[PDB]
């Protein structure tokens, strides 16, 4: 049981990290497209 | 022997008054010194 | 000097605001924000450009407006202002007094970030510290100039152990054999994210035994602004290193909770929108923690010393959490608490197997302590490991298969956890701790103590039961 | 035991704080009497010159209506606009070209800035 | 008065132009006027977050900023009332609009038509400081004191004579032109100032033996409880409200589901105050929010409730504050954070969740009010994570700042054990600070009896494996005695009937007597076992019935019963020999 | 530049039984020693620097503790070089850039160390290069990239980190110098996952 629990929490942490990275990339692309559409004037 | 705090209270009063008297000697000099530095 | 006011405020959102015509503001400067109501806040310049300068507000930005708000410069670098009279006082995380006493007179003003210590100017830590705890004193000896954090859980009593170490800390200069005069000992106590109950407990603990006379307190509450949590360790370490390297003090620095500091750092980094880390913490967390921890040590040519005992709580007892994992990569060891010993009622519940002190090899031996210190430490470690192995063997195949040596080691481990670790509130000396260690080492046969030399056997192997 | 030591320490600290505050109050009251001296026009002109030097390109200079005639000559030579302000007592303030940057030069502000630096000198003068 | 027009509408976010000079967190009226909040300033542009639905708005409509942040009205008329998350009386809203809450409706928190019996306590020419008492107004048996706002100083010029007045009447006029009314406004996000915060050296008597003895909470402390279904949390909360030390009770719903809130709203008016014949609602303030109400109200309800509690303790009383579900408030905070596109920290929660929880929980404590009188706030906030997992971040953040944790369990309620607090999981941190008070006011040996009872329960719980594997009859005499003593403890001391007339409330003296009787009987039984008496003979003694009926004895008649039972305990063993 | 690269055929005697027997490393090869904190990377690298058969030892403290550099500075002049008489410190070159020292200098530290090792190889010796921690160099790269607002690849690291690591590790090997004689460089880098 403890080994399965450790594997479960490791997998959960990995998935959460990937989700956070995807969210950060989405915010980055939104910021950069805003910067381009603002500086294009 | 619980009344030993009276000696310390008397010492505190005496040292406070001694500090006041000692610092009162150069009050005008300190005021002039700081006023000279503050002013241009 | 003169006063400059900038009123070119252009954009306020969240914790940030922009000043456009402030080219004179240096990077990292400290500024003052004043609104129409006369209230004055604090701020730091995190970015300066020709278009504008970005200022991060210390407190909340409620009440600010683009019409009447003005920004003024305080100083280019954050200076604290220190003096030898700070001893016995009580300040908050920002440095202002909170005991009601009038403000101090600064002898000098120093930057709070400090400067890196030249590795050439350092020297090896050599002298031990008697914490009054047998487990720390014998097996994980603390050396002057070391960073030795304590890893705790949620309900484990970290505060009580910290207060006990603060009360019972001594230098023991007579054991050094040189017989020199006793050097001054001071305690700098920094508190981050502390509730009212913990604050009252700490104040009562310090005032009960008179330890407040040689101590300086930096106490930052939980309801205080977030930025005050960041600056508290820097103020504490600035004061500590000033005292140590300008007045020959031996300073012990205790940090109540680094988890709160890490949470504040994560919140600030998220507000500034940096690159995230493993669990949302900023990527530069290792550098930020290093800039605090590395300030401890000893310097060639000076008699002072700085010692740090950080306290932190591992979330869910997870040693792989980013906070304890990054803390371990910097310090010279760690003291880990055990929930099993807490359930057994042992105090202090320190688990010796996962604990380690990397500087122990240099701070113990002849001249420093009794010359059997390393040998008895190894012997107790080996015996406890054998006892734990026997315990785990019993919990599978039963007690029937134990040899006489195995059951002897089992009863030795039981007596060990009942006497050596569970000291309660005793201020055990190094001599008393070594005597107890020898007393339960006599429980084993003479030929079974393979690590200990023959010189110490017979000289101290008196075969005496514990007198307590 | 340590209670008496803490009591004498706080008595000494309170005495030091009270005498320092007395010095501060005396200096503040002395500064309030500066305008009555014959050197008031000279010192206020010097302060205005310092403020204008600290703020290149200032478009205007504001001061007290009583002190406005004193700085009228300095306004002409410096070639900037001048105006009066009753609330600006014992000081002079410079306004930047854009109107967003201000440079203030007043006695009370200078005292507030330099008191922390001069506290050590005052203490070592009072107690040797 | 800053006025602007709508420039841009996108969802609940409204951009207004011409709003130069608007303060950062003022409340704005958007539209013809929906209530909003400024969250960003940029040039002449201000960003407004509208609380309600924005459908139907058009570009160019007026925007008016009230010039003040979110605030509550503090004064007479709050007791016996029900409010939403932002202090809007629901009864008058129902009267005006019917069964629905129409958007854009405006009402006053305090009734402007009711007349109160003013009674001055100040004279002309008297200096007044913030927090001083100006007068007196009766309200449902309480002495409601009109207090100076904390940031007001001056001296009295004139004072109105005693009579009938409304809350808008300027009862006291200061010499600087300031007019002081019967009420004032205070921002919900700023803690009210205090002279000093005292140490937790006095107990908060709950009236339940298990909570009062095993896991005490100090007057002004903080406690947290789980909320699992079927564990009888509601009856426990009602008993706590009925039998507490607090003079005033503040209840916050903060986003609970509709039917549970309906049950709470229909149950309290039927409760009766133990200290009198009237209903408990005459000293209770209700804040109710359903899960379909605007998120801003759900987020601000906690602050509104804690501010009301702070005001009531500033009047000099003891206040118990109960947050019904902080998990729903955390969910609302997460939603608001996601509306701002902030980076989530862990499992979607914002990085400042712990800071907000600490800021809410640290308003509790026993303090010396600005008027010099003593007051306190006790916070008992429940957490109900989805799935009951204790690793959820809100629970972890809560357990790091609370002083007590009363773990309600459904398993105990399943076997008809009430009030069903699990003693294995629960803990408290106020025992050491409260020990001197126990010695002074209960008995010199009270901590020893409490520790003995706890140790007996621990030993009973330690044997649960063997009694489950082989059964109770296979044990020795000592083991059977331990099991039966634990059973007697569970059935006669921890258990309590809330609906019983006399068993509903228990003082410290009765609990001490019961514990002493149990310990004495345990000692006598162990001595008899040592003297060769059979366990079955011990388990059939008649004094066990006297022990069992102890908790149903009246409070005033208890000492005689206790003395008789103590005599019978020693008589039953020694005389039989 | 070098004339030619040879094949490693002689062992790099680290002085430790397990490393020299079970997992040997040849002169001019590359080895990595990852592990969590407290495992003993620094002690192993110090033992390698104190007992190996390398003519010259270059030690790079890339973002690590300063006490470890102080211990070397204090102890090494007392010990003796196994290969030739005289104190050991005449065999060692130290590159110290502690944790509290500026972040951006870790990459420069690594490159300076590898360049000095290459020079001493070009003189014809057999040099051993030890990197105290390359994870700190990777973290510095990540911070610099985050200042540039570039797209991270994974865990915030720049996408070109692998190329940098490969370029750094490729500098090792046993070669024929431009002067017409044999020399080699051995690289042992620690990782802190
Ligand atoms: N070969 C060894 N013999 C004895 N003790 C050793 C040995 N290797 C390591 N240790 C012990 O392990 C401790 C930790 O080793 P070291 O500091 O080198 O680890 P590390 O992996 O470099 O750590 P960090 O990640 O903190 O930089 C040493 O202080 C020492 O007590
Ligand atoms: Mg290392």
From Swiss-Prot, chain A:
Q: Which residues of the full protein are shown?
A: 169 to 209 of 223
Record family assignment: Belongs to the V-ATPase D subunit family.
What is the stated purpose of this protein? Produces ATP from ADP in the presence of a proton gradient across the membrane.
Source organism, top-level taxon:
Bacteria
The entry's protein name is: V-type ATP synthase subunit D
Swiss-Prot record, chain C:
Q: Which Gene3D superfamilies match?
A: 3.40.50.12240
Q: What are this entry's molecular-function GO terms?
A: ATP binding; proton-transporting ATP synthase activity, rotational mechanism
- Entry keyword annotation includes Transport: yes
Q: Which GO terms describe its biological process?
A: proton motive force-driven plasma membrane ATP synthesis
Fetch the SUPFAM superfamilies from UniProt.
C-terminal domain of alpha and beta subunits of F1 ATP synthase (SSF47917), P-loop containing nucleoside triphosphate hydrolases (SSF52540)
The record's listing under CDD domains reads: ATP-synt_V_A-type_beta_C (cd18112), ATP-synt_V_A-type_beta_N (cd18118), V_A-ATPase_B (cd01135)
* Keyword Transmembrane helix assigned: no
What keywords does the record list, in alphabetical order? ATP synthesis, Hydrogen ion transport, Ion transport, Transport
The protein's matches in InterPro entries, at most eight in alphabetical order, are given as: ATP-synt_VA_C, ATPase_a/bsu_AS, ATPase_F1/V1/A1_a/bsu_N, ATPase_F1/V1/A1_a/bsu_nucl-bd, P-loop_NTPase, V-ATPase_su_B/beta
Q: What does this protein do?
A: Produces ATP from ADP in the presence of a proton gradient across the membrane. The V-type beta chain is a regulatory subunit.
Q: Which family does it belong to?
A: Belongs to the ATPase alpha/beta chains family.
- NCBIfam families membership: PRK04196.1
Listed PANTHER family: V-TYPE PROTON ATPASE SUBUNIT B
What is the protein name stated in its UniProt record? Answer: V-type ATP synthase beta chain
Q: Which organism is it from?
A: Thermus thermophilus (strain ATCC 27634 / DSM 579 / HB8)
Taxonomic classification = Bacteria, Thermotogati, Deinococcota, Deinococci, Thermales
Q: Which gene encodes it?
A: atpB
From Swiss-Prot, chain D:
Record-annotated disulphide pairs: none
Top-level taxon: Bacteria
GO biological processes:
proton motive force-driven plasma membrane ATP synthesis
Q: Which GO terms describe its cellular component?
A: proton-transporting two-sector ATPase complex, catalytic domain
Q: Does the keyword Signal apply?
A: no
Q: Which UniProt keywords apply?
A: ATP synthesis, Hydrogen ion transport, Ion transport, Transport
Q: Report whether Transport shows up as a keyword of the record.
A: yes
Q: Name one GO molecular function term.
A: proton-transporting ATP synthase activity, rotational mechanism
The entry's function note states:
Produces ATP from ADP in the presence of a proton gradient across the membrane.
The UniProt entry's sequence similarity note says: Belongs to the V-ATPase E subunit family.
* Protein name as annotated: V-type ATP synthase subunit E
| Location of this fragment in the whole protein | 61 to 188 of 188
Swiss-Prot record, chain E:
Residues binding ATP, per UniProt: 227-234
- Regions that span the bilayer: none
- Give any Pfam family that matches: ATP-synt_ab_N
GO cellular component terms given for this protein = proton-transporting ATP synthase complex
Instruction: Kindly state which keywords UniProt assigns to this record, in alphabetical order.
Output: ATP synthesis, ATP-binding, Hydrogen ion transport, Ion transport, Nucleotide-binding, Translocase, Transport
Q: List the EC numbers from the record.
A: 7.1.2.2
Catalyzes what?
Answer: ATP + H2O + 4 H(+)(in) = ADP + phosphate + 5 H(+)(out)
Q: Does the keyword ATP-binding apply?
A: yes
Is-annotated flag, keyword ATP-binding?
A: yes
Segments forming a coiled coil: none
Query: Please, one GO biological process term?
Result: proton motive force-driven plasma membrane ATP synthesis
Please give one Gene Ontology molecular function term for this protein. proton-transporting ATPase activity, rotational mechanism
What family is it from? Belongs to the ATPase alpha/beta chains family.
Role, per record: Produces ATP from ADP in the presence of a proton gradient across the membrane. The V-type alpha chain is a catalytic subunit.
Supply the name of the protein.
Answer: V-type ATP synthase alpha chain
Instruction: Tell me what gene encodes this.
Output: atpA
